[PDB]
Amino acid sequence: PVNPEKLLVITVATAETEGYLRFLRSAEFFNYTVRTLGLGEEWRGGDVARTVGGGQKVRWLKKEMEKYADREDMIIMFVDSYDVILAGSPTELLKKFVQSGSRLLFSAESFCWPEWGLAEQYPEVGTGKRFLNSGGFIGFATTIHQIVRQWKYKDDDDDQLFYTRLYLDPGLREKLSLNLDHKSRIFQNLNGALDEVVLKFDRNRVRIRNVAYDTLPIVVHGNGPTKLQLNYLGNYVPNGWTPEGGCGFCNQDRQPPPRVFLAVFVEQPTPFLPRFLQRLLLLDYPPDRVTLFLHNNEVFHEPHIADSWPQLQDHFSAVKLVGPEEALSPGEARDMAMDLCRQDPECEFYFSLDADAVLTNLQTLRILIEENRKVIAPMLSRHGKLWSNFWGALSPDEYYARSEDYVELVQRKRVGVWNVPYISQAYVIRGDTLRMELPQRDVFSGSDTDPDMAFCKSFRDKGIFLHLSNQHEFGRLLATSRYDTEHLHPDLWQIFDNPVDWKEQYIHENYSRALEGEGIVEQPCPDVYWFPLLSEQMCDELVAEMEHYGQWSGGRHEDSRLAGGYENVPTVDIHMKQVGYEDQWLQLLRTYVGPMTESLFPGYHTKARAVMNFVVRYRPDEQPSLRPHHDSSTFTLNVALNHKGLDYEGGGCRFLRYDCVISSPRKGWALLHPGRLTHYHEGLPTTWGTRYIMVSFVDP
Amino acid sequence: PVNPEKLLVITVATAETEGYLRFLRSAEFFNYTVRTLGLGEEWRGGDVARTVGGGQKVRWLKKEMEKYADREDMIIMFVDSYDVILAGSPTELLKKFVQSGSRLLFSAESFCWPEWGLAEQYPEVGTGKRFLNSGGFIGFATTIHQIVRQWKYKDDDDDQLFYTRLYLDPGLREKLSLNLDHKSRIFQNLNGALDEVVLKFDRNRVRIRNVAYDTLPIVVHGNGPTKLQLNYLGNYVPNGWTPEGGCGFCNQDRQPPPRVFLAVFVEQPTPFLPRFLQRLLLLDYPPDRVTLFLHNNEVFHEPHIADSWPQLQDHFSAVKLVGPEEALSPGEARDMAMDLCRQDPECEFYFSLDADAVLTNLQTLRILIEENRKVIAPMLSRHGKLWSNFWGALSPDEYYARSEDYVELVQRKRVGVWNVPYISQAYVIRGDTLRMELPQRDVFSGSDTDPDMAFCKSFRDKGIFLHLSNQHEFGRLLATSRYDTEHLHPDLWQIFDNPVDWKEQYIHENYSRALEGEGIVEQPCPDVYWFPLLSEQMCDELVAEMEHYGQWSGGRHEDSRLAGGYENVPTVDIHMKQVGYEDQWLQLLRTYVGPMTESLFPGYHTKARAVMNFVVRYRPDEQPSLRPHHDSSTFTLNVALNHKGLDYEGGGCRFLRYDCVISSPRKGWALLHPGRLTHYHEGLPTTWGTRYIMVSFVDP
Numbered sequence A, B: 001p002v003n004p005e006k007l008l009v010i011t012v013a014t015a016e017t018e019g020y021l022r023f024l025r026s027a028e029f030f031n032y033t034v035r036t037l038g039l040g041e042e043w044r045g046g047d048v049a050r051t052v053g054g055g056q057k058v059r060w061l062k063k064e065m066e067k068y069a070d071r072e073d074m075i076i077m078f079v080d081s082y083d084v085i086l087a088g089s090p091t092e093l094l095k096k097f098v099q100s101g102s103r104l105l106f107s108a109e110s111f112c113w114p115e116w117g118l119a120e121q122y123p124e125v126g127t128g129k130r131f132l133n134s135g136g137f138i139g140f141a142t143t144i145h146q147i148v149r150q151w152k153y154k155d156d157d158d159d160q161l162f163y164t165r166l167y168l169d170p171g172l173r174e175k176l177s178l179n180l181d182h183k184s185r186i187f188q189n190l191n192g193a194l195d196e197v198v199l200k201f202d203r204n205r206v207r208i209r210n211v212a213y214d215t216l217p218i219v220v221h222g223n224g225p226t227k228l229q230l231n232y233l234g235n236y237v238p239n240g241w242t243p244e245g246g247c248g249f250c251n252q253d254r255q256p257p258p259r260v261f262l263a264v265f266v267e268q269p270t271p272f273l274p275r276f277l278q279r280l281l282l283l284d285y286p287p288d289r290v291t292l293f294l295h296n297n298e299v300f301h302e303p304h305i306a307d308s309w310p311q312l313q314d315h316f317s318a319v320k321l322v323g324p325e326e327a328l329s330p331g332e333a334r335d336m337a338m339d340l341c342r343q344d345p346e347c348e349f350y351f352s353l354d355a356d357a358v359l360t361n362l363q364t365l366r367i368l369i370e371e372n373r374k375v376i377a378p379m380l381s382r383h384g385k386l387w388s389n390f391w392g393a394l395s396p397d398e399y400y401a402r403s404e405d406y407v408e409l410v411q412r413k414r415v416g417v418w419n420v421p422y423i424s425q426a427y428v429i430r431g432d433t434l435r436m437e438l439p440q441r442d443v444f445s446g447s448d449t450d451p452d453m454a455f456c457k458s459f460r461d462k463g464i465f466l467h468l469s470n471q472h473e474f475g476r477l478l479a480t481s482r483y484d485t486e487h488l489h490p491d492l493w494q495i496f497d498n499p500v501d502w503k504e505q506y507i508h509e510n511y512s513r514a515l516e517g518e519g520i521v522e523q524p525c526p527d528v529y530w531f532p533l534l535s536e537q538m539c540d541e542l543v544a545e546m547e548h549y550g551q552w553s554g555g556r557h558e559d560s561r562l563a564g565g566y567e568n569v570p571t572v573d574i575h576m577k578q579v580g581y582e583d584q585w586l587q588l589l590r591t592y593v594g595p596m597t598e599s600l601f602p603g604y605h606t607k608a609r610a611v612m613n614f615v616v617r618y619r620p621d622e623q624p625s626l627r628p629h630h631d632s633s634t635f636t637l638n639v640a641l642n643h644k645g646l647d648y649e650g651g652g653c654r655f656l657r658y659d660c661v662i663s664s665p666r667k668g669w670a671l672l673h674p675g676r677l678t679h680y681h682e683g684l685p686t687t688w689g690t691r692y693i694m695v696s697f698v699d700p
């Protein structure tokens, strides 16, 4: 058994990149011994991701190997560091090396690179990989020194070609006992073998398994165009995320805070923007340490920004508004906001937030800053759907693709901080990263590529990890796809696209607690129940939308009411189908009135059918009252839309057979009474002002 | 001015017939002086209504006139008595006689009788009547004596021919100044002039007016085949019935009573015969003075007669039953019953009563006996219709005809005792009339004529008046036309044909008082009303009719009930349409449940639509309960059909949302509760016996 104290891992790294630190973490997990060559030096090996080169690695290794030229007792493994993670122990590594019977074992790959013609000089192998890969090899220090000492070439010459031609010398190959890891027992190069590699999980550790050769490799090399696939594996292997310990690089549990440049982007008509702007004032971060930048591209949102701008300017240390009259494109606005933080050394963190991002966690900014990453984004999903603000994978031409663990992350079956290829809508970028690693102005612009994609690609080109955290509940994403702005209050029509946000804005705040019991629902008259339904904003906007239409009924008008025999009992009103809001109001009936009715009348079941839905207006000089009658309905919904005294005097509902009077209606509250046989009722005269009510004859 | 003390009326009468007494009454009304010739003698003038004759009148007048042969101061009017009424005063009579300028004025008529060939010897007249009528003439005693003294012929020779040939002597006509009353100024012969005579009314007196000649005749002669028309006029003229004094020959205001032979006739299947038989025990007349005869021709009624025969035999002095096994025809049975009283000198009055006669006035027998007529009938009409138990007129061939005052009598605009040509169903005949005036056995039989018509014709042939009294409310006539006896209880199906009687038998006795307020209706649970509806007999017969059908439902059966979502809530029941009683029960709903519902739920209006009508049976070994559910109805009718404790234990209705239980239902009482939304209810288990209820889902 070879002593693990005799094993030395040698790698090359000119800077402590995130890839290098990910490698060191995997090495320290198995208690490896790693000597790093080249830290602080300039990389003279040319463009590594674009062409051949990397000879500077061999030059540095050759100089380092002169100390160990006679050390037969020492085993040395050389690996890359930026795109390599370790998945096995040094004990298992050395046992597999001895089993190989080799004295210097190179990794094998599918492609004969960089000279494809040399592939016939290679020995013929069976199902295994056939050609040498310089990204990783392990052997005796003496044998390695005899190979690397022959290096006499330029810093940008290809290292793999140098090792390949030495391996293709049959005399040298057999004298020094050089070999290749054909079946990936030790080294797993990913390029050309993505469909052979799967994750193998354990309790507190993850590995990869080669399903082609049924092996458990020690070294995972994301060589060539497999960087993102290695990022994916690196989220688990070796102790990234485990079924028992969760993520092992996050903060599972949570004096001046860093100064932050908060940039808000409104690049399309967005629902509930006033609610988004008011939510900025509620973010749990000292506003004296936050600078606000807001780019609005929509003239539709100019009144919204203007309403809240005094409070924003009074809240944050400094504010800046870039409006639609500046003709900025989204890529230009995002370049400008980011460069405003880059050119300010007092900007310690950059926080980009889009209008369709609803942050339910007011501690989002603290949590992401405390995660201490270069770039990190909170996970935000469309409510009840799989769509969210990140991608797990890329198609070969850098387009959307679904990763194998995307659904587990969105559903939060696995939580942590994840290295992902794409993020959007909300992210926190370290300001020093913008200054030292991405100093260019054209991060979002420069191409015909989409700005969101150009931003992520600009960071991936620099080796910057794009982190995504589902460690906490952060928020959701608003549906903005087909937002109809051709209304006086477009957010009234958002009951389908954004139901959660529509409820919080238009459904009464105490509605849910009333539905869950708690003695909020009243019964002022026998079998006439009284519960809060609509918020004051819903009533104010609904009435406003009615008067904006203006076509109130009068004579020649018929309602589904029943007086003495044949008799016409009309109201001055506007029906929901007149204004195009019936489909929306019927959804409110199905979602909110239906379940309330079944709770109050045990035994009754309803789908909330309603042909007659309309808003009644009462006025002393128009029609101030409604004479006794029945309703063509099983039960009737009567919602007060304004305040008694403030907006009108008099009014009220009176149930004759009980001598019971709803003297003082409540704005947004609803009456629930049977419509036939027993509740002959009457609308008491409106003596002053104007009285609005919303009426629905349910289940006719 | 001729002194009325010089006027003498001479008439002939062998007996004081009703016609003679009607004449004397009219004479005494105007204070006439009447000498009657021939009382007590045998009529030897032959058949007067069948051929020529009447010379016995002239023989008696001739002998009487010898006293007055020289009395120039005396005016004498001769008239018939059996078919003559007086309509004017002697003063008006004598003024018109002087105006004629005649010394002996005969009545004129349209027909030259009895020798039609003599009519050319008559003088030519204009529009007036041309020929002599011997029924009435007025003249000086001297002139009359010179005419009648020439009588030298047989008792059965024609008097009119004797007077006619004397009048056709032109020398005698002009010497004695004989004349005819061409334009009916004094005498009005009815034969050949019915369309010229109308009644002229006054405050306390009625006359007749001749519309052809615009005259007011003094003497009305119903000569020949106009007896019934004179009977009609005699009901008014001169003081029969007047607009101010009413009838002047009736009892407008009401110690052993006379013995009576009560004959009951059941000649067809008759509805409510048990109720008729029980009503006999309630007639307000001492039953020790009544003999009961009952002829039943229907085997369908044998059980009914048998049920009540012990009580009848115990009630009346003597009883006799003639059943269907005797093969008697209605004419033979009515002959037998009438002759049983005729051959008994202890029978003082005969009271014939048919099964379709409902006597609502228990004092009917006293009232009719106190009227002191030979034959008298109480007016009984079909409820709300014009059909009744008498005719006002006859067609020329002795068939039905409507008299000019028929509707006034049936509607009781004119009330009194009326001389009518036909009566039926109920009449009281003086026993001595049967013994002295109609001794024949074949009163109803003998012809192919209908028995009811043969009976009336037998009395009209003898000059017996058939009196009808609408002076009081006496009763009604049952509809027996299409009585369907193919049921276990046929009277259940009588809601249409006899609604008044159907109500009194099957609608609860305290129902009406409950509908009119009076605090009988209860409200045991909120909006669940409780009122009496069906009598105990209705419940017992309805349940019996259900079990006689026997086809109770079970599995595979569906009702219009609503449980949790889609759910089947059936009952072991029989629907009304299965047994052919839906049209009848729907009538009960329209007539009795409808108005009660509108009274209890002010504002609601209903036509009592009900598709689901059925009788539910609950049993411990079958289906003892009904689980919570709603009803496919606006309101539900729940009628208990038997007694709790006596017929079943347990059971009852429970309304869940009110924690209210109808623990003790009442037989024949009905529950009225809404069927939807608020009154989720349940049928409590029937632990012992059998529980029946009638259910209707109204206004679905």
Ligand SMILES: O=c1ccn([C@@H]2O[C@H](COP(=O)(O)OP(=O)(O)O[C@H]3OC[C@@H](O)[C@H](O)[C@H]3O)[C@@H](O)[C@H]2O)c(=O)[nH]1
Residues within 6 Å of the ligand: A011, A012, A013, A014, A015, A038, A043, A045, A047, A048, A049, A051, A052, A053, A054, A055, A057, A079, A080, A081, A082, A083, A135, A158, A222, A223, A224, A225
């Ligand atoms: O700026 C740098 C770039 C690279 N390196 C070292 O050199 C190693 C090679 O870089 P990469 O992993 O990105 O390159 P790949 O493994 O994808 O394949 C590439 O390797 C080197 C290139 O010259 C080859 O042409 C190509 O095969 C790195 O893992 C790192 O250890 C630095 O130390 N500083």
Ligand SMILES: O=c1ccn([C@@H]2O[C@H](COP(=O)(O)OP(=O)(O)O[C@H]3OC[C@@H](O)[C@H](O)[C@H]3O)[C@@H](O)[C@H]2O)c(=O)[nH]1
Residues within 6 Å of the ligand: B011, B012, B013, B014, B015, B038, B043, B045, B047, B048, B049, B051, B052, B053, B054, B055, B057, B079, B080, B081, B082, B083, B135, B158, B222, B223, B224, B225
């Ligand atoms: O039985 C009788 C019948 C008749 N009379 C007297 O004789 C009168 C004539 O009898 P009716 O009124 O019934 O006969 P009418 O007036 O209809 O015509 C008839 O009169 C007598 C007949 O002989 C004639 O042939 C016919 O014209 C009676 O009014 C009555 O006063 C009797 O006193 N006893």
Ligand SMILES: *[C@@H]1O[C@H](CO)[C@@H](O[C@@H]2O[C@H](CO)[C@@H](O)[C@H](O)[C@H]2NC(C)=O)[C@H](O)[C@H]1NC(C)=O
Residues within 6 Å of the ligand: A509, A510
């Ligand atoms: C929702 O419920 C709360 C409490 O149940 C309501 O609150 C109160 O408001 C009144 C005056 O508006 C105060 O006098 C009370 O002290 C408040 N109580 C509490 C506990 O805060 C609240 O008004 C309800 N919402 C609406 C829209 O009516």
Ligand SMILES: *[C@@H]1O[C@H](CO)[C@@H](O[C@@H]2O[C@H](CO)[C@@H](O)[C@H](O)[C@H]2NC(C)=O)[C@H](O)[C@H]1NC(C)=O
Residues within 6 Å of the ligand: B509, B510
């Ligand atoms: C109709 O109403 C009368 C009285 O309102 C009911 O009569 C009483 O019957 C009870 C026992 O049945 C007696 O104790 C009372 O004394 C009776 N009262 C009177 C005033 O007679 C009668 O029962 C009702 N009819 C039905 C069918 O229930």
Ligand SMILES: *[C@@H]1O[C@H](CO)[C@@H](O)[C@H](O)[C@H]1NC(C)=O
Residues within 6 Å of the ligand: A029, A030, A031
């Ligand atoms: C690494 O070595 C330390 C001793 O310095 C030991 O506590 C730890 O358990 C080792 N880890 C593994 C995975 O063997």
Ligand SMILES: *[C@@H]1O[C@H](CO)[C@@H](O)[C@H](O)[C@H]1NC(C)=O
Residues within 6 Å of the ligand: B029, B030, B031
């Ligand atoms: C008839 O005479 C009596 C007197 O005896 C008189 O009282 C009565 O009024 C008279 N009737 C008429 C109608 O003249």
Ligand SMILES: O=C(O)CCC(=O)C(=O)O
Residues within 6 Å of the ligand: A561, A616, A626, A638, A652, A653, A654, A681, A682, A683, A684, A693, A695
């Ligand atoms: O004004 C009211 O409160 C009653 C009006 C009513 O019942 C209706 O909407 O038909």
Ligand SMILES: O=C(O)CCC(=O)C(=O)O
Residues within 6 Å of the ligand: B561, B616, B626, B638, B652, B653, B654, B681, B682, B683, B684, B693, B695
């Ligand atoms: O048994 C009862 O009283 C209730 C039965 C019922 O409600 C029904 O007829 O459907």
Ligand SMILES: [Fe+2]
Residues within 6 Å of the ligand: A553, A557, A558, A559, A571, A573, A574, A575, A614
């Ligand atoms: Fe309307």
Ligand SMILES: [Fe+2]
Residues within 6 Å of the ligand: A561, A629, A630, A631, A636, A681
């Ligand atoms: Fe209403």
Ligand SMILES: [Fe+2]
Residues within 6 Å of the ligand: B553, B557, B558, B559, B571, B573, B574, B575, B614
């Ligand atoms: Fe049924």
Ligand SMILES: [Fe+2]
Residues within 6 Å of the ligand: B561, B629, B630, B631, B636, B681
């Ligand atoms: Fe029911």
Ligand SMILES: [Mn+2]
Residues within 6 Å of the ligand: A080, A081, A082, A083, A084, A135, A221, A222, A223, A224
């Ligand atoms: Mn590499």
Ligand SMILES: [Mn+2]
Residues within 6 Å of the ligand: B080, B081, B082, B083, B084, B135, B221, B222, B223, B224
């Ligand atoms: Mn006569």
